[PDB]
Amino acid sequence: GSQKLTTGNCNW
Amino acid sequence: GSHSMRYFYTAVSRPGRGEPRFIAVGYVDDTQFVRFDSDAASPRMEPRAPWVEQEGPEYWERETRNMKEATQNFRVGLNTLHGYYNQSEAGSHTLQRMYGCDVGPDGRLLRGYRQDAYDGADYIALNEDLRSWTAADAAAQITRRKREEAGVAEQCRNYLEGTCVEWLLRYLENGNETLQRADAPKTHVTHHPISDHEVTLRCWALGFYPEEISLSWQRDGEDVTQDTEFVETRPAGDRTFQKWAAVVVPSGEEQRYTCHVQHEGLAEPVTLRW
Amino acid sequence: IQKTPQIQVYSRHPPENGKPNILNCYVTQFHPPHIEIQMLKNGKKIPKVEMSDMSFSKDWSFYILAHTEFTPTETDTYACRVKHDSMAEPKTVYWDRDM
Protein backbone atom coordinates (compact mmCIF):
# COMPACT_ATOMS: atom_id res chain seq x y z
CA GLY A 1 0.00 0.00 0.00
CA SER A 2 1.83 3.06 -1.31
CA GLN A 3 1.27 6.44 0.30
CA LYS A 4 -1.08 8.75 -1.47
CA LEU A 5 0.45 11.93 -2.80
CA THR A 6 0.24 14.69 -0.26
CA THR A 7 -1.83 17.81 -0.58
CA GLY A 8 -0.43 21.28 -0.13
CA ASN A 9 1.22 22.25 -3.32
CA CYS A 10 4.02 22.61 -0.81
CA ASN A 11 6.26 19.56 -0.80
CA TRP A 12 9.62 20.88 -1.88
CA GLY B 1 9.00 -12.01 14.90
CA SER B 2 9.52 -8.43 13.71
CA HIS B 3 8.54 -7.32 10.20
CA SER B 4 8.90 -4.29 7.93
CA MET B 5 7.31 -2.79 4.83
CA ARG B 6 9.33 -0.18 2.91
CA TYR B 7 8.99 1.77 -0.34
CA PHE B 8 11.93 3.13 -2.36
CA TYR B 9 11.48 6.11 -4.70
CA THR B 10 14.20 7.32 -7.08
CA ALA B 11 14.00 10.22 -9.53
CA VAL B 12 16.87 10.97 -11.93
CA SER B 13 17.06 13.97 -14.22
CA ARG B 14 18.73 13.54 -17.62
CA PRO B 15 19.20 17.07 -19.04
CA GLY B 16 18.68 17.11 -22.81
CA ARG B 17 17.68 13.46 -22.87
CA GLY B 18 14.07 13.77 -21.76
CA GLU B 19 12.16 14.33 -18.51
CA PRO B 20 13.42 12.84 -15.18
CA ARG B 21 12.94 9.08 -14.83
CA PHE B 22 11.08 7.81 -11.75
CA ILE B 23 11.50 4.35 -10.24
CA ALA B 24 9.80 2.65 -7.28
CA VAL B 25 10.08 -0.70 -5.49
CA GLY B 26 8.09 -2.02 -2.57
CA TYR B 27 9.46 -4.51 -0.06
CA VAL B 28 8.25 -6.62 2.82
CA ASP B 29 11.20 -7.74 4.91
CA ASP B 30 13.80 -8.80 2.33
CA THR B 31 11.10 -9.63 -0.21
CA GLN B 32 10.33 -7.33 -3.12
CA PHE B 33 6.62 -7.46 -3.97
CA VAL B 34 5.90 -4.47 -6.19
CA ARG B 35 7.74 -2.36 -8.80
CA PHE B 36 7.37 0.65 -11.11
CA ASP B 37 9.50 2.24 -13.84
CA SER B 38 8.34 5.40 -15.66
CA ASP B 39 10.32 4.36 -18.75
CA ALA B 40 8.16 1.26 -19.28
CA ALA B 41 6.19 1.20 -22.56
CA SER B 42 3.05 1.23 -20.41
CA PRO B 43 3.97 2.53 -16.90
CA ARG B 44 2.07 0.36 -14.42
CA MET B 45 2.68 -0.67 -10.86
CA GLU B 46 3.51 -4.38 -11.23
CA PRO B 47 3.52 -7.42 -8.89
CA ARG B 48 6.84 -9.07 -8.10
CA ALA B 49 5.62 -11.63 -5.54
CA PRO B 50 2.79 -14.23 -5.81
CA TRP B 51 0.84 -12.98 -2.78
CA VAL B 52 0.01 -9.57 -4.30
CA GLU B 53 -1.12 -10.88 -7.67
CA GLN B 54 -4.43 -11.75 -6.03
CA GLU B 55 -5.18 -8.06 -5.44
CA GLY B 56 -8.24 -6.63 -7.17
CA PRO B 57 -8.25 -4.26 -10.17
CA GLU B 58 -9.09 -1.30 -7.92
CA TYR B 59 -5.81 -1.85 -6.07
CA TRP B 60 -3.58 -1.64 -9.12
CA GLU B 61 -5.51 1.40 -10.34
CA ARG B 62 -4.75 3.14 -7.05
CA GLU B 63 -1.09 2.11 -6.92
CA THR B 64 -0.38 3.14 -10.51
CA ARG B 65 -2.13 6.48 -9.96
CA ASN B 66 0.15 7.11 -6.99
CA MET B 67 3.27 6.22 -8.93
CA LYS B 68 2.28 8.52 -11.78
CA GLU B 69 1.62 11.36 -9.39
CA ALA B 70 4.85 10.59 -7.61
CA THR B 71 6.88 10.98 -10.78
CA GLN B 72 5.19 14.32 -11.44
CA ASN B 73 5.76 15.43 -7.85
CA PHE B 74 9.39 14.32 -7.66
CA ARG B 75 10.13 16.04 -10.99
CA VAL B 76 8.99 19.29 -9.39
CA GLY B 77 11.15 18.48 -6.38
CA LEU B 78 14.19 18.06 -8.63
CA ASN B 79 13.50 21.41 -10.25
CA THR B 80 12.81 23.30 -7.02
CA LEU B 81 15.88 21.97 -5.22
CA HIS B 82 18.06 22.63 -8.28
CA GLY B 83 17.14 26.27 -7.69
CA TYR B 84 17.82 26.36 -3.96
CA TYR B 85 21.34 25.04 -4.60
CA ASN B 86 21.74 27.29 -7.62
CA GLN B 87 23.45 24.55 -9.60
CA SER B 88 24.70 24.54 -13.18
CA GLU B 89 22.44 23.30 -15.92
CA ALA B 90 24.96 20.59 -16.71
CA GLY B 91 24.63 17.10 -15.24
CA SER B 92 22.14 14.75 -13.61
CA HIS B 93 20.61 15.01 -10.17
CA THR B 94 18.71 12.53 -8.02
CA LEU B 95 15.94 12.69 -5.46
CA GLN B 96 15.32 9.66 -3.34
CA ARG B 97 12.82 8.61 -0.77
CA MET B 98 12.55 5.67 1.55
CA TYR B 99 9.50 5.25 3.77
CA GLY B 100 7.57 2.55 5.62
CA CYS B 101 6.95 0.95 8.99
CA ASP B 102 8.09 -1.75 11.40
CA VAL B 103 5.77 -3.86 13.52
CA GLY B 104 6.89 -5.93 16.50
CA PRO B 105 6.08 -9.59 17.26
CA ASP B 106 2.83 -8.19 18.69
CA GLY B 107 1.83 -6.75 15.31
CA ARG B 108 1.73 -3.16 16.53
CA LEU B 109 3.63 -0.12 15.26
CA LEU B 110 7.24 0.10 16.45
CA ARG B 111 8.53 3.07 14.45
CA GLY B 112 7.85 4.89 11.19
CA TYR B 113 10.18 6.63 8.75
CA ARG B 114 10.01 8.88 5.68
CA GLN B 115 13.45 10.02 4.52
CA ASP B 116 14.34 12.11 1.47
CA ALA B 117 17.78 12.46 -0.09
CA TYR B 118 19.19 14.83 -2.68
CA ASP B 119 22.12 13.60 -4.78
CA GLY B 120 22.87 10.68 -2.48
CA ALA B 121 22.89 12.76 0.70
CA ASP B 122 20.33 13.22 3.47
CA TYR B 123 18.06 16.13 2.64
CA ILE B 124 15.07 15.90 4.95
CA ALA B 125 13.60 13.21 7.16
CA LEU B 126 10.54 12.73 9.36
CA ASN B 127 11.57 12.47 13.01
CA GLU B 128 10.64 9.28 14.87
CA ASP B 129 8.00 11.22 16.82
CA LEU B 130 6.20 11.75 13.48
CA ARG B 131 5.50 15.48 13.81
CA SER B 132 8.84 17.20 13.11
CA TRP B 133 11.54 17.31 10.45
CA THR B 134 15.32 17.18 10.43
CA ALA B 135 16.67 19.48 7.71
CA ALA B 136 20.24 18.72 6.68
CA ASP B 137 21.00 22.19 5.33
CA ALA B 138 19.95 25.71 4.39
CA ALA B 139 17.86 24.53 1.43
CA ALA B 140 16.14 21.68 3.27
CA GLN B 141 14.96 24.15 5.90
CA ILE B 142 13.02 26.03 3.22
CA THR B 143 11.35 22.72 2.43
CA ARG B 144 10.80 22.13 6.14
CA ARG B 145 8.97 25.46 6.30
CA LYS B 146 6.57 24.64 3.47
CA ARG B 147 5.80 21.19 4.89
CA GLU B 148 5.03 22.46 8.35
CA GLU B 149 2.88 25.26 6.99
CA ALA B 150 0.86 22.75 4.95
CA GLY B 151 0.40 20.13 7.67
CA VAL B 152 2.28 17.47 5.77
CA ALA B 153 3.56 15.70 8.88
CA GLU B 154 0.05 14.87 10.11
CA GLN B 155 -0.86 13.31 6.77
CA CYS B 156 2.28 11.19 6.93
CA ARG B 157 1.47 10.09 10.45
CA ASN B 158 -1.99 9.08 9.38
CA TYR B 159 -0.65 6.80 6.65
CA LEU B 160 2.26 5.45 8.72
CA GLU B 161 0.30 4.59 11.88
CA GLY B 162 -2.81 3.36 10.11
CA THR B 163 -2.70 2.54 6.40
CA CYS B 164 0.94 1.42 6.32
CA VAL B 165 0.55 -0.99 9.26
CA GLU B 166 -2.77 -2.37 7.98
CA TRP B 167 -1.27 -3.23 4.58
CA LEU B 168 1.83 -4.78 6.16
CA LEU B 169 -0.31 -7.06 8.34
CA ARG B 170 -2.40 -7.96 5.29
CA TYR B 171 0.68 -8.89 3.26
CA LEU B 172 2.09 -10.92 6.15
CA GLU B 173 -1.06 -12.98 6.11
CA ASN B 174 -1.62 -13.47 2.42
CA GLY B 175 1.94 -14.61 1.79
CA ASN B 176 2.65 -16.25 5.13
CA GLU B 177 3.98 -19.47 3.59
CA THR B 178 7.12 -17.66 2.43
CA LEU B 179 7.31 -14.37 4.34
CA GLN B 180 6.89 -15.95 7.77
CA ARG B 181 9.24 -18.81 6.91
CA ALA B 182 13.03 -18.84 7.11
CA ASP B 183 15.21 -20.93 4.79
CA ALA B 184 18.36 -22.43 6.28
CA PRO B 185 21.67 -21.94 4.45
CA LYS B 186 23.22 -24.84 2.62
CA THR B 187 26.81 -24.88 3.74
CA HIS B 188 29.98 -26.46 2.34
CA VAL B 189 33.77 -26.02 2.16
CA THR B 190 35.97 -25.87 -0.95
CA HIS B 191 39.70 -26.47 -1.33
CA HIS B 192 41.76 -24.19 -3.58
CA PRO B 193 45.54 -24.78 -3.50
CA ILE B 194 47.70 -21.75 -4.23
CA SER B 195 51.08 -23.50 -4.06
CA ASP B 196 52.78 -26.45 -2.38
CA HIS B 197 52.79 -24.41 0.81
CA GLU B 198 49.46 -22.61 0.92
CA VAL B 199 45.84 -23.36 0.01
CA THR B 200 42.60 -21.42 0.24
CA LEU B 201 39.64 -22.68 2.25
CA ARG B 202 36.38 -21.08 1.17
CA CYS B 203 33.25 -21.61 3.18
CA TRP B 204 29.94 -21.25 1.31
CA ALA B 205 26.43 -20.47 2.56
CA LEU B 206 23.82 -20.80 -0.17
CA GLY B 207 20.08 -20.52 -0.78
CA PHE B 208 19.23 -18.91 2.56
CA TYR B 209 16.61 -16.37 3.69
CA PRO B 210 16.54 -13.76 5.03
CA GLU B 211 19.91 -12.20 4.19
CA GLU B 212 21.02 -11.64 7.81
CA ILE B 213 23.81 -14.18 8.32
CA SER B 214 27.12 -14.71 10.09
CA LEU B 215 30.15 -16.61 8.73
CA SER B 216 33.50 -17.03 10.48
CA TRP B 217 36.70 -19.07 10.60
CA GLN B 218 38.47 -20.52 13.64
CA ARG B 219 41.86 -22.14 14.24
CA ASP B 220 41.88 -24.86 16.89
CA GLY B 221 38.65 -23.31 18.15
CA GLU B 222 39.97 -19.75 18.38
CA ASP B 223 38.93 -16.84 16.12
CA VAL B 224 41.04 -15.17 13.42
CA THR B 225 38.92 -12.64 11.50
CA GLN B 226 41.64 -10.19 10.44
CA ASP B 227 42.80 -12.77 7.91
CA THR B 228 39.40 -13.72 6.49
CA GLU B 229 38.17 -12.68 3.06
CA PHE B 230 34.45 -12.01 2.67
CA VAL B 231 32.09 -11.11 -0.13
CA GLU B 232 29.08 -9.00 0.49
CA THR B 233 25.92 -11.00 0.76
CA ARG B 234 24.50 -11.37 -2.75
CA PRO B 235 21.08 -12.44 -4.09
CA ALA B 236 20.89 -15.66 -6.14
CA GLY B 237 17.95 -14.30 -8.13
CA ASP B 238 15.48 -16.81 -6.74
CA ARG B 239 14.77 -14.79 -3.59
CA THR B 240 17.52 -16.48 -1.56
CA PHE B 241 21.05 -15.28 -0.83
CA GLN B 242 24.70 -16.34 -1.06
CA LYS B 243 27.92 -15.50 0.76
CA TRP B 244 31.34 -17.04 1.31
CA ALA B 245 34.35 -16.55 3.54
CA ALA B 246 37.87 -17.67 2.73
CA VAL B 247 41.13 -18.03 4.66
CA VAL B 248 44.58 -18.85 3.33
CA VAL B 249 46.04 -21.73 5.31
CA PRO B 250 49.33 -23.69 5.40
CA SER B 251 49.24 -26.81 3.24
CA GLY B 252 48.76 -29.56 5.82
CA GLU B 253 47.02 -27.63 8.59
CA GLU B 254 43.50 -27.79 7.13
CA GLN B 255 42.33 -29.81 10.16
CA ARG B 256 43.08 -26.81 12.37
CA TYR B 257 40.31 -24.79 10.74
CA THR B 258 36.54 -24.88 11.09
CA CYS B 259 33.93 -22.59 9.55
CA HIS B 260 31.11 -21.36 11.77
CA VAL B 261 27.66 -20.34 10.56
CA GLN B 262 24.69 -18.79 12.36
CA HIS B 263 21.33 -18.08 10.70
CA GLU B 264 17.70 -17.61 11.75
CA GLY B 265 16.81 -20.82 9.92
CA LEU B 266 19.19 -22.97 11.94
CA ALA B 267 17.94 -24.65 15.11
CA GLU B 268 21.49 -24.13 16.35
CA PRO B 269 24.89 -22.97 15.01
CA VAL B 270 26.77 -25.14 12.51
CA THR B 271 30.42 -26.15 12.22
CA LEU B 272 32.07 -27.23 8.95
CA ARG B 273 35.53 -28.61 8.24
CA TRP B 274 37.33 -29.52 5.03
CA ILE C 1 29.77 13.02 -4.97
CA GLN C 2 30.23 10.01 -7.24
CA LYS C 3 30.48 6.45 -5.93
CA THR C 4 32.28 3.76 -7.94
CA PRO C 5 30.19 0.59 -8.53
CA GLN C 6 31.29 -2.70 -6.92
CA ILE C 7 30.88 -5.80 -9.10
CA GLN C 8 30.32 -9.46 -8.20
CA VAL C 9 29.93 -12.12 -10.89
CA TYR C 10 28.65 -15.56 -9.90
CA SER C 11 26.13 -18.28 -10.81
CA ARG C 12 22.85 -19.04 -9.11
CA HIS C 13 23.66 -22.69 -8.43
CA PRO C 14 27.07 -24.38 -8.14
CA PRO C 15 28.61 -24.66 -11.64
CA GLU C 16 28.51 -27.98 -13.51
CA ASN C 17 29.94 -28.16 -17.05
CA GLY C 18 27.04 -28.62 -19.47
CA LYS C 19 24.29 -27.94 -16.95
CA PRO C 20 21.88 -25.00 -17.49
CA ASN C 21 22.30 -22.25 -14.89
CA ILE C 22 21.74 -18.56 -14.25
CA LEU C 23 24.74 -16.23 -14.39
CA ASN C 24 24.44 -13.19 -12.13
CA CYS C 25 26.13 -9.80 -12.26
CA TYR C 26 25.70 -7.97 -8.96
CA VAL C 27 26.47 -4.25 -9.23
CA THR C 28 26.32 -2.24 -6.02
CA GLN C 29 27.56 0.88 -4.27
CA PHE C 30 27.31 3.40 -7.13
CA HIS C 31 26.08 6.92 -7.78
CA PRO C 32 24.51 8.43 -9.85
CA PRO C 33 21.85 5.77 -10.78
CA HIS C 34 22.72 6.08 -14.48
CA ILE C 35 24.54 2.95 -15.61
CA GLU C 36 25.13 0.61 -18.55
CA ILE C 37 25.54 -3.11 -17.93
CA GLN C 38 26.16 -5.83 -20.50
CA MET C 39 27.20 -9.47 -20.16
CA LEU C 40 29.87 -11.14 -22.30
CA LYS C 41 30.23 -14.71 -23.56
CA ASN C 42 33.83 -15.25 -24.66
CA GLY C 43 33.81 -11.47 -25.11
CA LYS C 44 30.63 -11.04 -27.14
CA LYS C 45 27.45 -9.26 -26.03
CA ILE C 46 24.67 -11.54 -24.82
CA PRO C 47 21.29 -10.58 -26.35
CA LYS C 48 18.80 -11.57 -23.65
CA VAL C 49 19.88 -10.12 -20.31
CA GLU C 50 17.28 -9.49 -17.61
CA MET C 51 17.68 -6.43 -15.39
CA SER C 52 16.19 -6.30 -11.90
CA ASP C 53 14.79 -2.99 -10.68
CA MET C 54 17.15 -0.22 -9.57
CA SER C 55 16.92 -0.17 -5.75
CA PHE C 56 19.14 1.36 -3.04
CA SER C 57 20.55 0.84 0.45
CA LYS C 58 20.88 2.68 3.78
CA ASP C 59 23.70 4.91 2.56
CA TRP C 60 21.54 5.86 -0.45
CA SER C 61 23.84 4.04 -2.89
CA PHE C 62 22.23 2.03 -5.69
CA TYR C 63 22.33 -1.64 -6.58
CA ILE C 64 20.98 -3.71 -9.43
CA LEU C 65 21.10 -7.35 -10.56
CA ALA C 66 21.82 -8.48 -14.11
CA HIS C 67 21.40 -12.11 -15.08
CA THR C 68 20.96 -14.43 -18.04
CA GLU C 69 20.62 -18.17 -18.62
CA PHE C 70 23.88 -19.88 -19.50
CA THR C 71 25.59 -23.27 -19.68
CA PRO C 72 29.15 -23.49 -18.27
CA THR C 73 31.76 -25.45 -20.17
CA GLU C 74 35.46 -26.13 -19.66
CA THR C 75 36.55 -23.46 -22.13
CA ASP C 76 33.87 -20.76 -22.48
CA THR C 77 34.69 -17.55 -20.58
CA TYR C 78 32.05 -15.23 -19.14
CA ALA C 79 32.26 -11.62 -17.94
CA CYS C 80 30.41 -8.47 -16.92
CA ARG C 81 30.98 -5.01 -18.37
CA VAL C 82 29.92 -1.79 -16.68
CA LYS C 83 29.84 1.78 -17.99
CA HIS C 84 29.45 4.40 -15.27
CA ASP C 85 30.21 8.14 -15.18
CA SER C 86 32.55 7.65 -12.20
CA MET C 87 34.84 5.57 -14.41
CA ALA C 88 36.55 6.83 -17.56
CA GLU C 89 37.12 3.26 -18.72
CA PRO C 90 34.37 0.65 -18.76
CA LYS C 91 34.95 -1.99 -16.09
CA THR C 92 34.98 -5.70 -16.88
CA VAL C 93 34.93 -8.55 -14.38
CA TYR C 94 35.35 -12.17 -15.44
CA TRP C 95 33.33 -14.92 -13.78
CA ASP C 96 35.31 -17.23 -11.51
CA ARG C 97 34.00 -20.72 -10.82
CA ASP C 98 35.43 -20.78 -7.37
CA MET C 99 34.06 -17.43 -6.22
TrEMBL record, chain B:
Domain of life assignment: Eukaryota
Localisation: Cell membrane
Organism listed in the record: Equus caballus
Protein name listed in UniProt: Classical MHC class I antigen
Taxon lineage: Eukaryota, Metazoa, Chordata, Craniata, Vertebrata
Covered residues, full protein: 22 to 295 of 357
GO cellular component: a single term: lumenal side of endoplasmic reticulum membrane
Record-annotated Ig-like domain positions: 185-273
Annotated S-S bridges: C101-C164, C203-C259
Biological process annotations from GO: antigen processing and presentation of peptide antigen via MHC class I; immune response
